[PDB]
Amino acid sequence: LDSKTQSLLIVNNATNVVIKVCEFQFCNDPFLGVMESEFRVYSSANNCTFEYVSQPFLMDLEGKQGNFKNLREFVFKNIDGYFKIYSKHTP
Amino acid sequence: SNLKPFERDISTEIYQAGSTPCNGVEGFNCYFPLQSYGFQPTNGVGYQPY
Numbered sequence A: 001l002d003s004k005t006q007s008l009l010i011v012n013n014a015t016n017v018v019i020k021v022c023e024f025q026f027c028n029d030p031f032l033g034v035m036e037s038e039f040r041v042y043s044s045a046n047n048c049t050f051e052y053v054s055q056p057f058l059m060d061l062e063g064k065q066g067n068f069k070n071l072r073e074f075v076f077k078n079i080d081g082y083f084k085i086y087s088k089h090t091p
Numbered sequence B: 001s002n003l004k005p006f007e008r009d010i011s012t013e014i015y016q017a018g019s020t021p022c023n024g025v026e027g028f029n030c031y032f033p034l035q036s037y038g039f040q041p042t043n044g045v046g047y048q049p050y
């Protein structure tokens, strides 16, 4: 994860799911700001081999406390070069 | 090590064949993994590009 090999990056930032496969330079403390005012998940793009962006949607974006309403489960596995993502959303 | 099916792996790390941690200079038991052969119209059947 230091630009010497290829690294898959998946971000779901409440609107459009974006998937990229780049030789990314990651920060010492990766983050996206929360109205959002930062984007520091990576610091460079170089010799990138794949990018995909989905359609928009709407999700939570603000700081709001309470009790949890949505359980969102995922499985991530890599078999013979195929990166398989499974998921289930439930109230 | 060898490759798993359909895996790609781009890397310019110079390959220490032995225990000499060269870490930036090619040498004995320290080579680059990427090699290139050339293609010429005068080459043989088995050495022409496909």
Ligand SMILES: *[C@@H]1O[C@H](CO)[C@@H](O)[C@H](O)[C@H]1NC(C)=O
Pocket: A013, A015, A016, A018, A036, A053
């Ligand atoms: C999430 O990332 C995508 C990547 O292109 C960007 O277009 C989108 O505006 C981002 N969402 C924000 C900043 O809320």
Ligand SMILES: *[C@@H]1O[C@H](CO)[C@@H](O)[C@H](O)[C@H]1NC(C)=O
Pocket: A046, A047
């Ligand atoms: C990868 O990035 C390097 C950066 O120095 C560049 O020279 C090279 O042409 C790029 N492509 C490949 C296939 O290595």
